[model samples]
Target chain A: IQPVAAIDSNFASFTYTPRSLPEDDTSMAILSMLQDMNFINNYKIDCPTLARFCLMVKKGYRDPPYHNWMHAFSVSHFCYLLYKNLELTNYLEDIEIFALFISCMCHDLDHRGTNNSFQGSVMERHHFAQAIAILNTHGCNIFDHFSRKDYQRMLDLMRDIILATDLAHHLRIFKDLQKMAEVGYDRNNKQHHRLLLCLLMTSCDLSDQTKGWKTTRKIAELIYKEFFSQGDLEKAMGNRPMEMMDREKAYIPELQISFMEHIAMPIYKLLQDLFPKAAELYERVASNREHWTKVSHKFTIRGLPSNNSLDFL
Target chain B: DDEYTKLLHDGIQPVAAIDSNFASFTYTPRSLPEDDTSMAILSMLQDMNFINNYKIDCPTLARFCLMVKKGYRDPPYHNWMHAFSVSHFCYLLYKNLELTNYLEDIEIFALFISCMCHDLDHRGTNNSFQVASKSVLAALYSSEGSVMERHHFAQAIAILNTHGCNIFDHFSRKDYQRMLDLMRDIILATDLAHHLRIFKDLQKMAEVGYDRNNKQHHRLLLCLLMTSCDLSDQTKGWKTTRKIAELIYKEFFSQGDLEKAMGNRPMEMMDREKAYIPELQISFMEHIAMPIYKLLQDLFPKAAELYERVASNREHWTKVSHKFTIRGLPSNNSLDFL
Candidate 1:
């Protein structure tokens, strides 16, 4: 005979664990909410690996701005979001979700610390090609350890997520999402949802302005540095170097401000609405950009050209 | 013009063969490989469908693959035959399977047509070369993996969808989607590094070895066969290996020679004096060949058993390449290796 339970399990402890919550204080809170709802469970999601990997990302990888474990975590997070709001949830169900998760996780699992643009410098399109093949083949083998329907789902996910992350795909993914969202989310329609999710994943991957100002400033600095590095490469290759700031010398930054603003507000605003917390995080990004601009302006006042100009000739 | 047309006729399967000049090399008829690959394909095409004997259509496919062939400057084997070999492998695979009856004649035709036409305009330099060259094609594939491989798939399909020649005739959108999926899988899987893992996965799929449980294996086997055809050299013995190496070397030097005259850097594998030569043409045979032989041993061990004589023959070419290197006449003829 078993003794009657005297303690109220739910009252004593919060029973529902949020799936979206972070594992620790440094972790994202929203992840716990997701975990509680069992939304991530639809993908046969492994919580321990996901938590550990996300932590790795927040700390940053050897390379910065991108190619970090966080980028992978971020992609997976977006995959979860896509799974949540996008129509794929209705038709895709559990297996497709798992596949999508796997695809997102494995997409750049062992990236060799380079960008797609970097291939121009290294002549490594074949390496990238091989990377793709390796991922597809390797991912499929891993995915197949499950059931057959799971295998198909994995293939669908791999193709969708990989193609969506392609930088060349930026315009299409952004425009498609905007059009779909404007048309309104149809819960009953699976295809629209699937397409919407694909676009959303792409958007988040490129949502540079969604981070907190501190993170945003850090990221912007990283991007600027990366651009400068690429410029150095271009010069080495006998090509023209890029000019990020033409101000103090010719003053092009002011002229380019309008284009930059279009990126900051409306585009980012739309993304923020989809992710309110992400928008809140943008305050840090906005102020960081301002701080950098001021610092850069001060440098210009001192009449010192940016370091990139030394060999510009 | 008479010699040209004669070259297209008197030669075996000449109608399907492109001039080696257009392929970025020269080939004397006496030394041409004896395989009538094009004729074999034409026969397969006939056996599957009673389409008119329009051998003329082959010129388009031949030119397309040759363009892709010359796109790479190393290894020299990445040419029209590679494309042809891909198509032939798929055909052989289809013929081997009983379950592929669901694939239908049109699907098979489209598979071959896609494989044959996929590699048009290749610079012979791998995607890595394109990245190094800052070629627009590199940017086209983007941050995602295998950009060129994807581009190859999209281009081939786009060409098929062109109004004048809708090669995938009478297929439903769903059927067309499946066909496209298969074609993409096979064409994209051609990257050599991907070959081993893919074949290993496929071998495992076939290990359970039942037709009903392993329908996907049918599709995967076709992928494996395409790779086998791409690495056809491992199956050839020493004499043929030397001949092929010289052909490849000629292909390499010719490209490098052009780059030198044009004041451009030679592609990595083709760079004559660069510390890191792609080595794919002569010295690098074992890198790919050994793995390929190992794969053959696992998948088709009987074929590997038959390969001992060929492996011994390949040893002779390796020594010749060393001799030629020492003499500083690095681009020696195939006969020298023999």
Candidate 2:
């Protein structure tokens, strides 16, 4: 929830510490981050209205092992950093950029910490629907100042981008984006821009892999904790859980190496090839992958993994 | 002094100022280096057995420090770094002088928390700005002097309540209330308004020199300790001291700018063009800082080192003031100003 004061403007800086609870300052960070982009001031968003809306969004995040307000803040911070570093405003319109930033902030609204394979799961569509409900709540209308057309279009883009966070949607999105990169992006082609936006959402969703070594491992452990919690519930429900989710067999270094090689590395490599400034992201991913590979080798050489041995994971 | 004057003419970065001023403090976390202030506070708390003795989990303490860090505003001074510096000095005094022998365990715990949170949620502006603008905070605490200090205490309580971070959960209702009361007193003692009273109180105690059996004497000593820690910036070497002075004046001058905009005439101390740092620093050390540190030396011989440092800085300021006079610049007011 929002504090009496706004968050420090330095929240998204490279030197800012992430292990500290963002929940303590996330509301302030959200307002300040948006203000830095001139999103709030440009739109003439009421300060108190934005504060109330941020608090509502924070309260919307149910306490889970990993997917909570803090996680939401980190993802939003990454999106903000990416926007500034890539200078996305140069290519994307102001409305588009605002939509992308807002989508990142609200993508995991009220996440239940369950995988989407289950029936009736609250997946991307549900999260998007729930975000709309939250935004429309009493005294929480941050978009009250927007024109009707702008509001409707922003909602549409946000919903589409939020749904694109489903990892299942990644492959098709990547394929379309890969075709665009090959032929060079055309501004007139609407589909190329939308698909690029989807890829950007997916990257921001898994932005943990692109951070420094310490933060990368910290996020990896948080994800594993969430997975293992789901695995615990599945076993209790008489379901045979996947090895990657099972706490007993979740070998972290191997899981990280596989994820990097098969998933994160390729997507980042493609993005870096398209936007040369994105090379920094790929470098972080490559560095993290090397570290994980070395850790996995050390585990194999030792022929045993103690708690301390897996600490580097 | 010439080298310091050269550095002064060259200008000082804030970081260089902190490093020079903060070098001689004897407190450092074995686990955390400087810059990791949250971790350093936690490490110091753990080393002091605050976790075990106070029945707090390490993670809760970590969260509390994080919350405290977040609670502070981005002021030029009076920030988390300043809070940590003050708290670290309290730790140094407690460890170096063995004040634990004289103070209760609960009192010691309260002192550390009080030091770390004495300036929570400080606006860049001062209490004068709050009064002149008829701010809500001024109206809320106008009856009780030190309005900003009271709000800081309230903010500290808010953070302690959040995230199940009640480190005092182990205390009985009576003891909990007692700790809160002591913390309030200690934090309120940090106001420069109380500096003179605390100095006089401790000076009277120093004549007989810290009788552990006398409760009133001990309380006044603790109050003096809080006052000393609040002004500890002046005890660091000249570069650090001057740097902190610049930052303090930066905050003061900004408040002056706001006051001027509000159609109020600012005080000489807040007026950038009117303030001569050498004069003000000399007066502060002589009338305020030196008296307290000098009294402290009677109880703890190692505290003599603080007196020496303050004296050296004062002499250096005097030299600077003399140079200003030679250059036909306006120095501070008369020697009887204090």
Candidate 3:
């Protein structure tokens, strides 16, 4: 009964009960999400061992103000929602569906709330590696039952999907998405398969905007918590940060507005165009944008601080 | 020179067998008209339909091919003939293996053009030589190292900038940017250090199994295929391959002469006085050449014949190495001083 209840539309909504639970109980909810989604039986997964992979994946994420285990679960819950709601079996391969669900849980693993472009390395690569290591440890090898080709294919798929969440990479390759949608998506093309999976990965990664206004505004402050920390660290290190990172210099509404308008806004719109059932995601993002716009006017008159301007939530 | 009349054909079916003579599908540039090569490359461009999707200036493409040819220097083994040979094999991969069915179009385009321009303006010297000498070209690379690799990309870039030779001018501004980045990657992949790194990565890929839909796999595959095409000379008939080896040593020995004369020690492979052909060739194939084709065939079962031919070449060299060996003992004879 619990698995059935967990499997429904509520998991897709902002009001899901799992978010209110303690971190330990989120593991119990994860087990339900996987079983309810039928990933274990469908992928020929080892039930007990797969449960350990889930346990370790939750154990893997480090606590930042956000981008942590709770966020990982939230994102994966949303991904499972799209897979169930959009009826992805008709479109994506079972392997791809399985990979997307698992990749969301591992996407931001061990995040340090620091810049990845440390211009020095792959923080996303770090995430992929850490997630890979969890499955590879002797006891938690959830993919141990996979055929050799399927196993190799999973590593490649996971790397591609996790790295697809690179906000910078999305910008660079975003034009390909625009051209894809304009041409109309192809069901048979494997390039279409890769790009669509990547698109879904980004869609779930940024699904924070699809939440109710109170939740969306509240989440933005915690993200800014990391952004400002990095900015202060950069200032101390003698490297000037971007205006968005610089808490003192950043205008709160402008940064949030540009992100939603230019980045999150377009991704949600494309998803709805591809599958009109995703219309709710786009509609909520529209509402979220107005919330920022309403706040933008108040801030312009009084020059609110990026650190606490939207703490109204 | 009589022009190579272009066939009014559409689509590609490779005209030659894998282990057959290179001449079955190719012409030796020396004693042959440049006209044949100029027309053949354009033939390849059309055959692959690189120009068809977004039509290029036919006259300008011809200009681009000639510009590439003129960029070659007079080196015996690493000159115009070798570049043309490498580019031809890339076409064979495209046609015979039907890679066009899977690989990105921009990638295929990059593969052909990069192979054509990979060794552009090569001066019979290596990266280490450039680094050791600290010459003008030595410091020219922006970051560091791969002086020869870096220069070929610069030369390739310059050719594209030539008004009539810019075949990629029709690409969207971003696609054009994407084109040059892929070109640089393919060009630098011709460097041995880069090849060795990808070789290890590929062995890991092969051991686990190759992926048809993986981009990490795609980048590594492009590099590996460029390598196989570059070394396709070894997959040729023994007599032709044997003749090519002498041309290589002639260049190497001349460099050894300069190095010793300049009071610098040279590698044993470069030392004409120290190295014997059969022994050296046997070891070369055993270590480097054998593993590449063997691994390539392991990944693509249809490529078995290429590995088989490479084995045949190794067997021939091994037989010669035995013939040169003394049965039990040899009287020490004073070697004649040159």
Candidate 4:
């Protein structure tokens, strides 16, 4: 609501933009970002209409600690950062770059914080349908001015990018990228290239874990809070929460350690291989790990008050 | 409790009565204290039923355990509890594995008894701290390369010399001296400094697939086994491994506190506030714990479980380390956000 209030038609006139989404005023933040991106590509769109759509999308995000508008903004911001930092324009076609950002923004348009398996296929499918419903609402079709073929292709690409954000699809992309990284990627293969775009979406989705310790720690805490909240729901429903989701028994350091190693590290490591400058992603992830280890060690020591029986010994 | 009388009464028991829950007990060594210790000794002797088999008396063995427990100082980590844990590993190996078939009754007895007394009167400090300060004990044993080990061996002899505790009385004088010689090797082998040579020797034996009939080969394996048991604390689940490391550092940092008070510099690992647990643990496991267990696994497949546990614990440390890295916090540096 705050972001909707700040949206300005003249935002496209801005010459400079940030690399990340503002945590507050996310609607205006994303509109300003999209304006700059469109301006740079010399594309024409009604800035005011697009701003309203972004605001509507922000409003649609449920009030979860994670997987909300803030998360979507963060993901979009990282995709933007990588595009700019990696000079991806040289490697990625203009439309593909557009697809990447659109996919990131709408990927979790109606995330309930609870994942797909919990809600079953019906709810999962409804999320994508709901996103399209929001786009078609009030006859506010931002893509209406485009030629029919371009408009249709944009929708198809948007669907591909949005579906790829599912973590279940990540393993296949992870394996494909790993192989491509080891033996150079063949750019001529269109489907193979699409896998890279899908990877880019997942990477942005998970970029928080590969950030600096302060940011990563802050973000990780919020994520675990959401996970624990869902776990509480599972318990109330008379179901057992997984160890990672169970706040009561979850060893924060150990749980995070496993997640970073088994999930985040490989993705970032592969991304860095593809884009050498992205090595900082892996470095930050590694640094955060060291801090977690230090904290875990301290936690272990503090929990064990020196045993009085053995104090003198 | 007449300590010896309590020990004699509580020490030896039927094998089934002693708890076997500790097969994974490497982490929670402090859980049972002296009672767990007495049972461990009783269990080992009972499992081998060694005293009955060797025509030795149970009361003498029980009194020996009590006297040795009496000798250990109240160090937070390496006290009677640590000694008990180490002895438990040796006992576990002997009772549960084929390792016992390679050694004679005297060697097996020596291995168990040596673990019981390896850190006797440890003073809650390491050998380097003893020698660097020129403490009275250090002054007395300065010529020996292993000053603390020599001291532990001497303390063990004094307990063995105690009345009603000489369980080895049945042996001929030559056999008694031989047992003492083996006990000295086993006790001294508990020192981590000797770990390199022992590790290499064992690694060489494992390469050849080990011949049980060779006396020297058996001695090397016993030394290797003693060292493995000494570090058994590192080979547990992450929860327990972390706990044991905390206890160990607690003791080390206390000594570091003493050294600082005495105007001496302490090792970085001893600096409680500055030391990084993940870094130190990772290095220790890679450099010491893993290689030793891996070699042991090479010789005896049962040791593979120990290797797996150590590897798992190391992975846990590494995971935590990575999480800290992502959090962008100061690692091993001052937490004061400057």
Q: What TM-score do all the candidates reach, one by one?
A: 0.38, 0.46, 0.47, 0.52
Q: What is the DockQ of each candidate?
A: 0.00, 0.00, 0.00, 0.03
Give the distance in Å from residue B231's predicted Cα in candidate 1 to where it truly belongs.
1.4
Native contact fraction, candidates in order: 0.00, 0.00, 0.00, 0.01
lDDT of 2 at B338: 11
lDDT: worst 10-residue window of model 1 chain B: B326-335
Q: Can you tell me which runs of candidate 2 are displaced by over 4 Å?
A: A1-313, B1-35, B322-338
- Against the hidden true structure, what lDDT does model 1 obtain? 0.47
For candidate 2, the lDDT comes to: 0.73
Q: List the residue pairs that clash in candidate 3.
A: none
Q: Tens-digit lDDT track for model 2 on B264-323?
A: 998877775565556666788898889878887887887888888889888877775533
Clashes in each model (backbone N, CA, C under 3 Å)? Answer: 43, 1, 0, 25
**Per-residue C-alpha lDDT of model 3 across residues A1-313, encoded as one tens digit per residue:** 1574644546645445335557776777777777777888887888778778888888887788877899998888788788778888877888888898889999998888887744413888899999889988878988888999999888889999999998888887788888887788888989888988889999988888887776677677777777877887898999988877776666667778889999998998888878888898888998989988875533321111122111211
lDDT of 1 by residue, A176-252 (tens): 65765576656577765566445555555544444433444344444444454565576678765435421112222
Instruction: Report each candidate's C-alpha RMSD, comma-separated, in the order given.
Output: 31.8, 27.4, 32.2, 12.8
- Please give the RMSD of candidate 2 to the true structure: 27.4
The candidates, ranked best first by lDDT, are 3, 2, 4, 1
Once fitted onto the true fold, the runs of candidate 3 whose alpha carbons sit more than 4 angstroms away are: A1-313, B1-34, B322-335
TM-scores for chain A over all candidates: 0.58, 0.89, 0.91, 0.84
- Candidate 4 residue A260 Cα shift, in angstroms, is 29
